[PDB]
């Protein structure tokens with residue numbers, strides 16, 4: 001597609017100037033560019049790192065000589081470098097280790113998550129399946145459920161005293177609920193820190209159930225049975241304990257993992273940090289437990305798609321039909337399928353009747369190849385999302401994402417830790433936190449900082465998506481930019497869709513329009529917040 | 543495009559800001575759900591045989607983010623000040639909140655006044671529950687006057703659902719960002 005990179009001869013012709021001294025900085029560039037070409041027995045990582053040297057060399061020439069006439073030629077040389085990265089990425093490939101990585105932490109894996117995972121097992125017999133759990137942390141979801149429920153009723157006690165709606169909308173409800181959740185959550189953190197200063201060998205679940213027994217009179221026998229049932233269930237479903245994943249545990253992002261797991265009860269974020277380190281150290285394809293295998297290309301491409309239905313409507317309808325007539329997943333929704341005409345419905349009933357094996361319904365992954373430089377990512381509505389990742393073991397980008405997540409957590413904790421150290425209510429702690437954010441905010445990180453200031457709200461307030469910017473897809477784009485701009489710790493993303501499309505995965509490798517993907521486990525929108533309000537009102541009145 | 547146009551979409555919660563940018567950049571209204579993706583709303587446009595990257599940024603309209611939101615305002619070339627024509631509180635917050643806020647942080651930056659959800663003008667259900675007060679939907683003539691009064695460049699209507707005036711809103715957004 002592109003154009004071969006310029007030779008040592010081709011660059012002097014390009015960067016030629018008259019009355020020129022051939023500088024030591026300029027020769028350094030030619031010297032490095034010559035070596036790059038006779039490097040035909042080296043791996044792509046060594047090659048990539050040459051290009052990084054070349055670019056860093058080019059940049060010091062321009063910083064030292066700001067009026068030189070070669071600058072305008074060397075900048076165009078730089079653009080050739082970034083093109084060669086894509087040449088590196090596309091030609092010399094490596095087979096991807098046949099590992100499918102899932103992550104379910106914080107509580108018991110439900111049958112929907114297992115049913116979905118089994119669809120990946122049944123059609124990828126050659127694939128080692130790994131379902132990551134954290135044996136010390138089975139009670140985080142129970143703790144969160146108890147504290148949030150407690151906070152819903154405490155919030156509604158301040159609503160019964162008052163009338164229908166003087167100014168008591170769903171907006172005031174989630175604001176007041178947020179203040180009460182932050183007092184309870186801070187109380188648990190304070191208890192968690194005190195117990196690990198007393199004896200730091202205590203596991204997380206041991207501290208959670210004493211806290212639950214002491215504050216909510218929870219029967220510890222029923223919680224040890226939940227733990228034993230959750231450990232039993234995951235160990236029969238390809239479980240891999242995080243605690244026996246030593247490279248993660250000894251890593252620098254484990255303190256970040258436990259921050260979200262224990263302090264924030266954000267398991268989406270904890271899962272964001274763990275997934276990338278599992279690729280860096282084991283390699284393979286990571287998948288979210290709400291993602292299904294890809295449907296076979298020539299299937300249902302006999303039924304004409306009606307004009308009166310969205311494409312995205314059609315993609316959901318497919319899976320619904322499969323499950324309705326082939327029942328591979330029980331309790332799967334049928335609501336989009338049940339909204340078509342009887343004739344187009346029986347069209348689905350005919351085509352599916354004609355198939356016997358699940359190989360004839362879901363594509364298999366098979367032998368997959370990829371570049372040692374790249375981590376491939378899934379695309380959704382013209383945007384990257386880490387709900388599908390393919391990476392070669394110890395890929396250059398995989399390390400770049402980890403450092404990107406680590407860097408963002410450094411900025412956050414820098415501004416957050418001083419504020420939470422002062423033991424004040426939510427509103428005061430927010431205001432102190434934001435004061436610090438604005439001080440460290442410029443035009444390059446402003447938009448990222450804009451999102452950090454909501455960090456305490458994540459998973460308890462409507463329309464808060466800080467996790468995306470901290471541990472999620474933003475850090476993957478900033479990494480891809482780091483790769484393409486021979487940089488470390490990119491913040492201001494200058495890349496567009498077509499740039500990022502370099503790292504997509506075939507839409508035939510994942511079905512993304514699943515039932516469970518429509519319900520986010522860590523985020524909710526305004527509309528779903530308004531619903532919850534009338535739901536809580538009636539659940540309290542009963 | 544070697545030249546980048548920062549357009550920042552501003553306005554009250556639940557006026558159709560997010561759906562606006564999704565509908566425009568993907569040609570698909572997100573009726574089903576919004577996936578938790580890195581947004582990266584960036585359209586390449588050719589104008590007088592010169593390539594431009596149009597950068598679109600969503601914002602949190604709510605009071606709770608009144609101090610965080612302007613952190614994204616620097617380097618802004620054009621604002622879409624948005625209001626739902628079936629929500630006169632969103633329209634009355636254009637004069638009272640949004641136009642002051644952008645003239646405070648970006649005083650020389652032009653802004654389009656943008657009507658959203660126009661399809662819900664001719665919607666049975668939403669009229670009579672609105673008609674349960676003084677409230678009536680906002681006429682394009684009322685909003686064209688507020689545009690002139692507040693020194694907006696233009697008034698533009700659109701529906702993210704029917705994509706009706708949708709392409710025009712953003713066309714006029716680059717025109718604001720190139721005019722003196």
Ligand SMILES: Nc1nc2c(ncn2[C@@H]2O[C@H](COP(=O)(O)OP(=O)(O)O)[C@@H](O)[C@H]2O)c(=O)[nH]1
Nearest residue numbers: 554555556557558559560561659662701702703
């Ligand atoms: N009828 C109609 N509804 C819309 C339109 N744009 C958005 N909506 C809906 O109105 C609500 C506005 O939400 P959103 O787009 O998130 O606005 P934001 O909160 O201001 O970003 C959502 O429930 C949308 O589904 C439109 O053009 N027409």
Ligand SMILES: O=c1ccn([C@@H]2O[C@H](COP(=O)(O)OP(=O)(O)O)[C@@H](O)[C@H]2O)c(=O)[nH]1
Nearest residue numbers: 103104105267268271288289520521522578
């Ligand atoms: O209680 C939870 C909730 C989420 N997750 C992890 O976080 C991912 C995010 O799932 P979701 O689809 O809810 O995220 P979204 O797609 O809404 O960003 C899941 O697949 C899990 O790996 C988890 O381990 N425990």
Ligand SMILES: [Mg+2]
Nearest residue numbers: 559560600601
């Ligand atoms: Mg929005």
Ligand SMILES: [Mn+2]
Nearest residue numbers: 288290387517
């Ligand atoms: Mn999901």
